[PDB]
Symmetry: D2
């Protein structure tokens, strides 16, 4: 059978706004920071890592094509450790954790790091006609960030597919704005109570007034009221719209990682771990309805884990859009109180490549806060996919 | 225990030159072409695939961040099938096959496609300052292609690391120029004898004189002689150089894929498969000496396989540079007559993201040609890694 | 002999900061605004213009290569009127007035408009390798604004040539900072007293809070003290520097124009004019010492006008850098109280293409304010030239 | 009265094709080459020039904003000589000669150089959003070359205005294709008989096979036949088109200049001059019908000269398009045998900024060949203008 996978430690950066506090920090620099910190938290030497896998979507510079390896080397991992970068769009952060856990499951490693890093502020523009020239006539600089946010089959913004899901699953504008407001209020309460303090790695963000610590998710609106969302206009469709900038996730920069070990290696070392991996699952859906990808994925994961929806104490389902997050919770029969108890993409931000690993850290630290047992981590994926994993607090 | 993985079908495109026959075919276009073909050759319904994994390094357009999912859908694979894009630099092609095989080993799927697709001719230029502006002073147009060919730690071209490998392991200029010539002559013989016909998928390359079929690797030199390589000057160092444009691999475009099944699912379908997966391994090395990555990876793969170097009847060890290929064969004690019997990167080309899956097709089709048992597939990886897999003809 | 040239009317925009209030107004849009306004002020029909000449240096868009014609047509001038764009770097605004006055002098026209328009905020970046491609290796986006500010022979910033002039003519740092401070104080007093109100054409600058009138030169610092300039560091040389951002002119956007007529046409119409043209002169100097170009140019103009330095009641000599503005006033023996009585480039800004015509408007309105008789307008020119003109209040 | 202006010397480069022999020679390079030559041919010290004026439209690099001053200095003209760059679109070349002649007419100088220089192959692409950023969404790479060929009011290609001129003045496709063929045959005859030898300055164009002299206009078709033009399709309109790539001028690179002196200064130096300036004129017309600009300009020039159309022994009327050239000759009543006797824009090419000074050299050298008296030089101007000058052989 497959070896049991133990998550011993995890960390994330605070989530920077588009063009915000982390705009000057490359994805490989952010990746290396979290790599070094999860090693310290796990009490694991950099020379004892079997594998490193990182999620990452939008290459910002040539270094990013070496992202996992640069994060590992510059994070203190010995050069004998293999490093892999994976891209499953917004599921990449969780895919990296799954892929790294697979090396432990199959016996290829006893220690593996899974994380994700993304800086969308530094997303580049490309010039397709630069290498061989344009000769005559205007050309274009292609926004690679917005291009990533476009379905590659119908060439529509991800927000259009959110309208398809809202229309198909009866998600009203009022319901979307209700989730968006509650998300900000939840994240604001978490920040005020310090629920993220232990899981966040402060970053010193060199300013002209001196070095200041960036350690709080800056997308959150702490004074949000219902009218703040009702006044906004739809942004992705010109007719019968419901998805606004207020009930859509943000564009952000961040990194996160977890350190995993085989159960035997965790016993022998005597670590006090966060959680163990129970199961994971994938799913594909209609690209035009990608927002409900988490629904099947989550159903297969519960089947694999032999669990039910009522057994989930904590649920981290990324709020890409309130339109799809409502449909996901509605289709699975989840309790909105247990789903994203401290906010999510709408309030804290959506650093696409790192989100999957970022909200895994959130789920595991929330289990420790409430003494819960099981946590579900799931998110939708552009192109029409879903990914889900279940962890057990131990 | 882990499930046994069977390779039932495989195919590759002809390798196009930089700015050559496939310059107008995007990576997703090439990816879908090979996805549909592996399904046909294996006689597998697109509704019966459990996972698709594609290796790919240099994003040429937004669509490329969805490459695996676009190649699958447009290749005829149902939308319920998950799709993953992996980046392990030049090992990406073989990593995609490994990652796909792992879904079968772990019981997450009983059918999986693994391949790679790269079009370096379409490699873009980026403008890091385009999003938020430059304000004042000249900015740069970054060559993402050349940037991908630079070690991210010392910012040196991969050819510089090839010189380090030559100096450390005593590979002479005459030794490099010998392998380069032979590689070209082995490929010319292979194309003359038609050894590549079955494994290659032709592509109609819409010319102004009518449609013509591109089905022959165009980087080969059929009239090569020893003088053809001696006259060239070193390219990557100003002093005591040995790597030239002739003894170094080319910059090429191509795609390839293989369809794999569980041993039970292949038994149940009556498919006549190519080979079965014996073992795989990864390794990390000094980034400055990334060229000898295949050595520890090949040794580890043989340990897992319980085999020796002398049991390998076919070896596809990518000729990234003659400097490192000679050292690889040298340090492993391989028979050069069994290594790259029909050429490799120097002669056929190096479509980095697709090479790993491309030479796997070669190795398996060569095993059927000579009636052999075991084949090794290995290649070096920028940043200091190596990957290796062993297959058994059946 | 040559016909006498009468300046009947003139106007300028307020001077916008780099990336400031006029950043959204193209050079042709600003040019057309002033063209229409000088026609109204002169009581001249757009169908009665013999010639239009505009100064302009940095093309921001294709339209700018048609600048004079677009400003004329869109300004209300009939299509039967010829339009010319001239480029003498920072002397272009005054060159346009000279060139237009020449058509009257030679009898080719009885009515001509001379002005200048420049928006340096909208200065573009070029891609020299875009048309025919780069193939491989990084390229560059060329800052055309900074390129304009570089001597084309030694490829040094204009500020380096200002250091050459300060060194050769004994202009201390303290003296440069003394002129810079006094310039801001003079411009602030002029703004507070309303000396520019009549000569400025307000522009409604569409903001999200509503439409607000832009009618005040926004580069001026109204609370400047001596320490504000002493604390600044040299900006153009690494050793023995004196030229700072504080004692150097600004980079700005603006437009200006004057309407001129033959003396006979002015008599017949019965206009109440601003001034008449007395003489003009050009000069070339060492490019490395371009800052003292005004010295000879001004000497030849006084010779042509048969006047002396003591006969000048008003002097508008552009403050490109305090380094050269001090040397100019020192070499000519001018009274600093009569030179730039209401500030200049350092405080009000330097919209290079429009500056020449802009400060002509300033000089003529200042003559009316003090009841003076003669005004000198001169400025230095990158590449090593000077230009000067003398007007008489009538 | 006004002083008499004498043309003592002139020279032009061979006209290079778009991306042809002069693609590597910047406009300032070509400008300096012709400046030095006119000085030599006239035997005038570079210390004795009073003004330099150059026409130039499309800035290819920062240096081009200094074009007149760079061509002068690097051409051997002393640094005390002022230098001016003028832009009247395709009339820039003749405008530079007019502006230079005006310095002599007004007594500001007794020696002046007037020319033009354009390299459209090096015409750049701009990024208007590069300075302050795009933030989100695709931006454009603006073709400054094609943009310069667009009317700035209706944003239509100049060829569209040629269709308007053809429709309004009844110029048939067969009439346009006839002028195009003849223009090519006249040029071929001129090159065969060596008519251009004296007036052309050869340029060694550093090739990989050794240096070769580029001294022959390369846009001409020496084997042209009526069928060569009938087979081409209209290029600028989808319906009822008549302007083709064959009957329209080309996109070319070249430079030219002339050295002029006051009649008294030429008398005092014993120079044997080419011709003297009789008169010049400007005109404005409907931008949509800019092609007939030469008609009112030529009529006005003849009035000032006190001459008739029948006194003109040579006419260089630029063939911007056969559609407008036919109408120009038609509305003026000119003898097509006297118009462009050795070809023009269609056959020889159209280096827009240099054309005006280029065909002036042609007209004067043709007057010496046929022993004639009066020559007319005229051309249309984008945006709706025309310029014309008359010279007298002496
Ligand atoms: C929706 C989207 C296009 C908005 O882009 P944006 O304009 O840059 O968003 P911003 O927050 O910077 O500003 C939007 C405006 O709404 C306002 N706004 C946003 N959220 C608000 C809130 N909760 N309350 C009140 N106002 C709000 C902003 O203040 C801002 O107003 P301003 O311009 O006057 O300052 C972008 O955020 C987006 O695409 N999000 C989803 C991305 C995605 O596809 N993720 C993955 C999908 S699987
Ligand atoms: C080496 C490299 C820089 C050469 O770039 P290139 O100039 O575009 O290569 P080209 O084949 O187009 O031209 C090189 C010249 O050598 C010549 N040449 C190359 N191979 C030759 C041969 N076997 N015999 C004779 N001449 C040869 C070419 O004809 C060409 O000459 P030409 O310009 O007169 O036509 C590039 O191919 C490279 O980077 N290779 C290694 C890439 C890499 O890092 N792969 C991954 C490493 S793990
Ligand atoms: C000198 C130059 C390079 C400065 O560029 P800049 O950095 O964009 O100038 P800015 O005003 O935007 O900012 C410079 C800094 O000096 C400070 N500064 C400028 N003038 C100041 C003053 N009078 N008092 C106090 N501080 C001042 C600014 O506040 C700013 O500080 P900050 O960054 O903390 O906000 C540029 O203005 C220049 O080149 N000027 C001359 C151009 C020229 O060649 N003209 C034609 C020559 S013939
Ligand atoms: C008309 C125009 C758009 C053509 O652009 P182009 O495609 O680059 O021109 P090219 O000569 O390179 O190619 C055109 C095609 O027609 C053909 N052609 C052109 N002239 C021909 C002739 N006299 N006989 C036969 N064929 C001819 C070319 O061979 C070429 O065919 P190919 O591609 O198979 O080789 C461009 O030249 C133009 O804009 N001309 C007018 C410019 C202008 O506005 N000047 C100022 C106006 S005041």
């Amino acid at each position: 059978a497959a070896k049991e996978v133990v998550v011993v430690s995890g960390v994330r950066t605070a989530i920077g706004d588009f063009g915000g506090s982390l705009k000057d920090f490359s994805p490989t620099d952010l990746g290396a920071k979290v790599v070094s910190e999860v090693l310290s938290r796990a009490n694991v030497s950099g020379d004892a890592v079997g594998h490193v896998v990182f999620g990452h979507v939008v290459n910002t510079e040539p270094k990013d094509m070496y992202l996992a390896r640069v994060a590992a080397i510059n994070g203190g991992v010995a050069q004998h450790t293999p490093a892999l970068t994976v891209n499953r769009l917004c599921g990449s952060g969780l895919q990296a954790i799954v892929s790294a856990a697979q090396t432990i499951m199959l016996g290829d490693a006893d220690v593996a790091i899974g994380g994700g890093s993304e800086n969308m502020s530094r997303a580049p523009y490309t010039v397709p006609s630069a290498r061989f020239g344009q000769r005559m006539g205007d050309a274009k600089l292609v926004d690679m960030m917005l291009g990533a946010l476009h379905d590659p089959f119908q060439t529509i913004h991800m927000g259009v597919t959110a309208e398809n899901v809202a229309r198909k699953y009866g998600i009203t504008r009022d319901a979307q704005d209700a989730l968006a407001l509650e998300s900000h209020r939840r994240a604001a309460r978490a920040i005020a109570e310090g629920r993220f303090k232990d899981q966040i790695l402060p970053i010193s963000i060199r300013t002209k007034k001196g070095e200041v610590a960036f350690d709080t998710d800056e997308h959150v609106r702490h004074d949000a009221g219902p009218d703040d969302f009702t006044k906004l206009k739809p942004v992705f469709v010109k007719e019968d719209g419901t998805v606004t900038a207020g009930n859509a996730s943000g564009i952000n920069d961040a990194a996160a990682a977890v350190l995993m070990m085989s159960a035997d290696a965790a016993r022998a070392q005597g670590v006090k771990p966060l959680a163990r991996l129970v199961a994971y699952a994938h799913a594909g859906v209609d690209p035009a309805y990608m927002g409900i990808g988490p629904v099947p994925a989550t159903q297969k994961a519960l089947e694999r884990a032999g669990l039910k929806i009522t057994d989930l104490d904590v649920i981290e389902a990324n709020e890409a859009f309130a339109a799809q997050a409502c449909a996901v919770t509605q289709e699975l029969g989840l309790d909105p109180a247990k789903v994203n108890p401290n906010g999510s993409g709408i309030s804290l931000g959506h650093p696409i490549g790192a989100t999957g690993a970022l909200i895994t850290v959130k789920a595991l630290y929330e289990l420790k806060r409430i003494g819960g047992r099981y946590a579900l981590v799931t998110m939708c994926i552009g192109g029409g996919q879903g990914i889900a994993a279940i962890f057990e607090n131990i």
